[PDB]
Amino acid sequence: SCSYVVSRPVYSELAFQQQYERRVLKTLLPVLDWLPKYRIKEWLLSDIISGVSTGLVGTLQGMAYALLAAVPVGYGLYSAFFPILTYFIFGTSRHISVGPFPVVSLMVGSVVLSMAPDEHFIISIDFAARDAARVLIASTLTLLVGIIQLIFGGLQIGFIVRYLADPLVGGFTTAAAFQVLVSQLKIVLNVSTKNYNGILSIIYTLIEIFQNIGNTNLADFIAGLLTIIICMAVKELNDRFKHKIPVPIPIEVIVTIIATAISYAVNLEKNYNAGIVKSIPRGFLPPEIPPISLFSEMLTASFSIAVVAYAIAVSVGKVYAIKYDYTIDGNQEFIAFGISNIFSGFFSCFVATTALSRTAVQESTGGKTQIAGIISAAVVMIAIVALGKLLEPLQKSVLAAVVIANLKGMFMQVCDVPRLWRQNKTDAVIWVFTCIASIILGLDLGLLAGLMFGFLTVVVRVQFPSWNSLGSIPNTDIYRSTKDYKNIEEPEGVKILRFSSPIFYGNVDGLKKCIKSTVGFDAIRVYNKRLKALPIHSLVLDCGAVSFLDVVGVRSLRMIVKEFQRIDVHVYFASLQDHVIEKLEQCGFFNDSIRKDIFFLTVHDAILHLRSQ
Amino acid sequence: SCSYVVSRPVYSELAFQQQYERRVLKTLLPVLDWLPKYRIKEWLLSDIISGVSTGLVGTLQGMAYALLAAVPVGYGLYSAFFPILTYFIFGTSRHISVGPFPVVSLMVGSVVLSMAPDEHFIISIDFAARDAARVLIASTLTLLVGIIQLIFGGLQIGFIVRYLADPLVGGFTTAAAFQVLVSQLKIVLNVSTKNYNGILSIIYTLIEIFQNIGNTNLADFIAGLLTIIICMAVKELNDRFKHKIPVPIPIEVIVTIIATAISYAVNLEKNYNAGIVKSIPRGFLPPEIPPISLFSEMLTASFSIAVVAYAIAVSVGKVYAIKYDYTIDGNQEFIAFGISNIFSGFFSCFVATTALSRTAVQESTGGKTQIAGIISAAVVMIAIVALGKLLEPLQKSVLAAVVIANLKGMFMQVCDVPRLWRQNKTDAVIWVFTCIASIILGLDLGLLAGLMFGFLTVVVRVQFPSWNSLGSIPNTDIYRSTKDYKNIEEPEGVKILRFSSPIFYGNVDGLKKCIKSTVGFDAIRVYNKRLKALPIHSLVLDCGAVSFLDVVGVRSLRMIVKEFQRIDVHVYFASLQDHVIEKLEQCGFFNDSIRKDIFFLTVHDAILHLRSQ
Ligand SMILES: CCCCCCCCCCC(CCCCCCCCCC)(CO[C@@H]1O[C@H](CO)[C@@H](O[C@H]2O[C@H](CO)[C@@H](O)[C@H](O)[C@H]2O)[C@H](O)[C@H]1O)CO[C@@H]1O[C@H](CO)[C@@H](O[C@H]2O[C@H](CO)[C@@H](O)[C@H](O)[C@H]2O)[C@H](O)[C@H]1O
Ligand SMILES: CCCCCCCCCCC(CCCCCCCCCC)(CO[C@@H]1O[C@H](CO)[C@@H](O[C@H]2O[C@H](CO)[C@@H](O)[C@H](O)[C@H]2O)[C@H](O)[C@H]1O)CO[C@@H]1O[C@H](CO)[C@@H](O[C@H]2O[C@H](CO)[C@@H](O)[C@H](O)[C@H]2O)[C@H](O)[C@H]1O
Ligand SMILES: CC(C)CCC[C@@H](C)[C@H]1CC[C@H]2[C@@H]3CC=C4C[C@@H](O)CC[C@]4(C)[C@H]3CC[C@]12C
Ligand SMILES: CC(C)CCC[C@@H](C)[C@H]1CC[C@H]2[C@@H]3CC=C4C[C@@H](O)CC[C@]4(C)[C@H]3CC[C@]12C
Ligand SMILES: CC(C)CCC[C@@H](C)[C@H]1CC[C@H]2[C@@H]3CC=C4C[C@@H](O)CC[C@]4(C)[C@H]3CC[C@]12C
Ligand SMILES: CC(C)CCC[C@@H](C)[C@H]1CC[C@H]2[C@@H]3CC=C4C[C@@H](O)CC[C@]4(C)[C@H]3CC[C@]12C
Ligand SMILES: CC(C)CCC[C@@H](C)[C@H]1CC[C@H]2[C@@H]3CC=C4C[C@@H](O)CC[C@]4(C)[C@H]3CC[C@]12C
Ligand SMILES: CC(C)CCC[C@@H](C)[C@H]1CC[C@H]2[C@@H]3CC=C4C[C@@H](O)CC[C@]4(C)[C@H]3CC[C@]12C
Ligand SMILES: CC(C)CCC[C@@H](C)[C@H]1CC[C@H]2[C@@H]3CC=C4C[C@@H](O)CC[C@]4(C)[C@H]3CC[C@]12C
Ligand SMILES: CC(C)CCC[C@@H](C)[C@H]1CC[C@H]2[C@@H]3CC=C4C[C@@H](O)CC[C@]4(C)[C@H]3CC[C@]12C
Ligand SMILES: [I-]
Ligand SMILES: [I-]
Ligand SMILES: [I-]
Ligand SMILES: [I-]
């Protein structure tokens, strides 16, 4: 059919260049962006129902996630109230529900516990002073996270969540699910376990839990087990029986209400000594300035918490924006969430982000603009000021059981590891390394280690590329690996090397080794042997995949050219890009008899030029 | 002249594949490697003179570098004696002199001081107990460094010194020169400065030195100043007046001998209260087992010290092996230096490597096999057992002044910085970052920060590549950037994108943005708009520079292909390598109507195929 017919001069870089010559209302996102653009006629009612539903869900979610953080139940209500109010202004996303997201809450609680242990703080037991210190530490960490997020918004470096690769995100998610399960399993059993801060901490906690399982509160354990079973069964029924009832079943809220009513009717606090919350303040606490002197002990934790929370927020926002066909500004997501975390930290709250389950609840029940968020915040507020007393008899085991039941989706990511291994071993290695690191480390330290391991994998992949010795398909200009096709004909007296990577320090050492192996000799050795006494005449370097080039790369290429020219062997570079040749010429490569006449467009001009001599 | 004439079928990947089918005496390096091959007839005498000269230099260097480490003078003699003996066996290199190399000594001393401060150890002043503790800490660190080096030799991962890029090596060298200068300036002034451990430590030390400059010992300062001046003057004369006297002038040894004799004659210890060494033990101390319990506090320091010492050793070994036309095994350099550091740590020595000045002295005075090293070790031994008393009146200011005088070569790299900036800004950024980090951090922490910053620079360079929209030179098959050559003709209804980087998570986000900008529209947006209602017909991706590919890359490519096919826009991949296509097919790319018929050999088969329709 169609044919590849081309007739043109043999163009080196010099000849080709001679013939073809080269050469104010967003950083503070207004509510006025959509409030005048609102649809009160029909959007308002949908926003009302969506906000009521997601507020009912988020009040419970904040109460439960206040257990992940080492703060008393009641400050989760503030963490579910204030950030939504202060995100309604600066938020690009219009479908996400702002709240604790128990992974971020667990990291905050780890930081708070490490900075306020039971034995280190209390020598009496002073529960009130300990709780005050824990709340202050959580507020300080939230303020630092907000400061970091706002700074990253000013720097406009919103691509950092790119560095959170999907394999390491999955591994970190599985490890965080394990950590959350261990903490909430400590909570449901109502066992007293001394806090372990450091390496292997989750294993120490599990060991102590298995040792103290004899002190398990029976009523709390049964309540947690039944809550887990009921929530899981109803979730499975909803997933299976999904054709009807498009709205998800709010099983967690119903179970919590039933548990609270039963505990109030039976008085589990004193008859069975169940671990009820026992303390939910009524009213709004006045703002306080967090002690910034602790910022030095929270930097590595605040950075990772900010990164993780922002990544979750933008992930959910993008998932719903592609569905609803709009865009979200990542830098403005920085700005909004940093302002939110600063505002919440001034008001005794832990770090805030979005939760996938709460966002799904908000969207599925008539998801519209952030007015639904305002309605949810109002519901949380009326829970704070009116329903605080009604939730006193609720056991903490029920909340921890709800969290554990929701942990199943995060736990099921271990099934992707064999698939990753079969597809790309590097990604499976990243997954496993991130999971293991986040297990035996802090979650913040695990995330940092995963990021560094991803960088290491990228560097290693660009450092040990696929290099080949090429030859031409007969009667064509297609140069393929000689040992791969069995019909490749080797040219007479010339070796062609394809080094499929940008050449840098690691790659300059690798490329020297590859050239020495391909040509079959070392230029230094043969030159020295010839000097002491006193098969290849040309080497073509297929540099099509050489992306960038550093000073070490230019120096190595210059040394290779000189060393091979010393033994009357010519080195020709082919398929180099314009920018790489510009980097070569600005690094002083074209000095001492180089003159750019040894640079050809592809690896067929070089071979044709050689055949002309 | 020569012409580029090719007549061949238009080959897609499918058609091309259908028509062209694919498919025990070294780990313990013996002295018997060269001892039977020795040249006693004429090599022995040259070895004798070379060993005598380099031993005279190395005794002084060991005593001087024992001040960089926080150990008494006399243990530097052991550090210059034992490692040479135990490297004569396992060493591949035959020209290097094994010893302290004051940068490694300074890192060891920083570790030792941070673990045995004056105030933390002594509450009386117990100089003897403090010195014993410092020696034990130095021996423990040396043993840990040797263990790490031996493990790295077992793993055969000798390419890690590749990761020590020349810019970061230069920045670390300049910062280490500054640190050594500050410490030896504290020593020469004989000022009592409390040790600062942590961040900004060198600036605190400089501040305290400038505050205590009123307590400077005048005699020690004058001795150090004249030692520095004489060393600089003689070195400059030797560099200039270099045609005669090929052997370098051992000015440091002569200066030390003269200073020792003058101090003995005048008794500066009592008359002028000069800071003489005052204590050099006579004889060999028995070996002791270091306390391994300190290994937990030395891991980050020992890793960096081992890496730096091995890098210096292999750098010097390669510099002299290329000159003398032989090869050195990097893994065996691990093995030899790990055994050396273990042996020396058992015998109260700090970490050992090679020094460029001492190696130059050994080589220039008749450099031959490591028998010269044995002679140097014998000279150090006879200095230990006989000349220990003769060096008692020598001031420490003379030794510190010798080190400061030798620091000039390390200091001269701020001159290399500006041309690095003018050539490759990334390498200059790496240089400056490594220098500043190693200044305000530990030297070990600075090295780790520089290595990880180099990894970050590689990741960023492969993450933000040079991408272009290509068009064809008329009547040829050369596709160049349309906005760069001004004679490029845009083809009808097709856009060609060259993304000059391997496609991974950072690059998948970048590539989505680049495709959307190049084609001028978003596939999701136009598809959604067309669904709501109810200029380019093909996109060619020049993937010549796509080196590797991950699961995220394959997912992004499938997503792009499907999104563009949904709007009747065909996506063709060109110039993909065989291994990248293998990765695509093993990652499930060729499912759901892909069939590999949209993959062409170069970006001219795709265009010719399009013109056929
Ligand atoms: C954007 C890019 C990323 C940015 C990342 C930023 C990280 C910042 C780390 C900051 C840092 C190192 C600085 C140098 C780091 C060099 C790294 C080189 C890396 C080379 C590749 C500061 O180090 C010093 O720490 C002192 C406290 O020790 C602190 O306080 C002193 O002065 C105060 C008055 O100022 C005074 O009030 C106070 O009394 C003094 O003590 C000092 O101010 C501070 O300088 C280490 O501190 C961090 O915080 C904790 C400290 O304990 C520690 O927490 C862990 O605890 C758990 C166990 O308990 C553990 O299990 C958890 O994991 C974790 O909760 C962190 O782990 C650590 O990291
Ligand atoms: C191949 C690639 C590189 C590998 C690098 C390997 C680094 C290993 C670091 C090990 C490490 C963290 C472990 C987790 C790290 C996670 C990193 C995640 C990074 C993610 C990107 C261990 O952490 C704990 O430290 C305890 C001591 O604090 C130690 O001792 C405890 O138990 C003992 C009984 O076991 C008991 O006897 C003892 O009493 C207990 O206290 C514990 O055993 C140990 O687990 C930190 O320790 C290292 O050593 C020092 C400690 O102080 C510290 O020294 C600094 O001091 C200067 C100021 O004074 C500072 O200015 C200098 O800089 C530096 O001299 C280092 O900085 C630190 O690093
Ligand atoms: C929807 C429901 C499951 C929410 C949780 C309700 C809680 C408060 C209820 C449900 C079932 C109850 C348990 C049922 C049976 C027993 C056995 C009895 O000898 C002690 C009380 C104990 C252990 C009860 C404790 C309280 C309990 C766990
Ligand atoms: C709290 C403690 C017990 C958590 C321990 C989690 C560890 C042991 C788990 C978490 C994820 C797991 C990995 C997930 C998937 C695979 C692939 C399959 O071939 C089994 C091994 C392997 C590689 C698993 C090994 C064990 C693993 C790393
Ligand atoms: C403590 C735990 C996490 C230890 C490790 C157990 C987990 C990770 C292991 C054990 C059982 C494994 C599963 C067994 C069988 C299959 C079928 C295969 O077609 C896909 C992977 C999948 C689904 C495996 C995924 C990894 C797996 C879930
Ligand atoms: C990809 C790269 C950057 C990951 C680097 C991870 C390193 C720094 C981490 C991972 C696991 C860590 C180890 C985990 C456990 C212990 C035991 C403890 O008693 C001393 C510290 C020590 C020995 C840690 C040292 C640091 C360590 C080796
Ligand atoms: C050639 C080199 C090696 C000689 C070094 C010997 C040293 C110890 C000698 C040489 C010159 C000497 C100085 C000469 C002059 C004075 C001034 C006097 O009021 C106090 C002693 C003092 C400050 C001497 C101290 C010791 C000194 C510094
Ligand atoms: C102990 C203290 C004084 C050490 C201080 C070291 C710092 C301040 C020095 C060391 C090397 C220096 C750099 C060396 C070279 C250049 C290039 C020129 O354009 C001046 C700026 C710049 C980039 C310098 C900036 C300052 C610098 C980074
Ligand atoms: C900018 C270009 C033209 C400079 C050309 C000469 C270069 C090699 C020289 C001239 C003056 C030098 C600077 C002079 C003073 C200092 C301060 C100190 O911290 C050392 C580095 C630094 C910053 C030097 C770096 C190197 C330097 C900039
Ligand atoms: C490329 C990567 C590895 C570089 C990482 C560098 C980071 C971890 C280092 C570089 C300089 C460091 C800072 C230097 C000085 C101080 C002041 C001290 O009171 C608290 C810690 C703090 C604030 C350090 C935190 C960690 C830090 C920001
Ligand atoms: I969730
Ligand atoms: I949940
Ligand atoms: I030296
Ligand atoms: I020296």
Tab-separated table of C-alpha atoms in Angstrom, chain A residues 1 24 70 76 78 139 190 218 234 240 296-297 314 360 473 487 493-494 501-502 611:
chain	number	residue	atom	x	y	z
A	1	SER	CA	0.000	0.000	0.000
A	24	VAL	CA	-6.567	40.066	42.613
A	70	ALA	CA	-5.641	12.615	71.442
A	76	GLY	CA	-14.095	17.137	66.846
A	78	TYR	CA	-15.323	22.314	66.399
A	139	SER	CA	-4.287	23.478	67.974
A	190	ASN	CA	-11.233	-0.162	76.835
A	218	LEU	CA	-17.098	-6.818	78.068
A	234	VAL	CA	-25.615	-2.905	55.920
A	240	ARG	CA	-25.365	-5.422	46.479
A	296	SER	CA	10.296	23.313	66.429
A	297	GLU	CA	9.005	19.901	67.567
A	314	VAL	CA	-7.496	17.636	45.847
A	360	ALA	CA	-20.118	11.041	48.799
A	473	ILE	CA	17.378	-3.616	8.722
A	487	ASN	CA	17.984	-10.452	10.762
A	493	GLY	CA	33.726	-1.292	11.119
A	494	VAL	CA	31.233	0.876	13.023
A	501	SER	CA	18.507	7.772	29.082
A	502	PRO	CA	19.593	11.364	29.746
A	611	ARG	CA	29.860	5.003	3.593
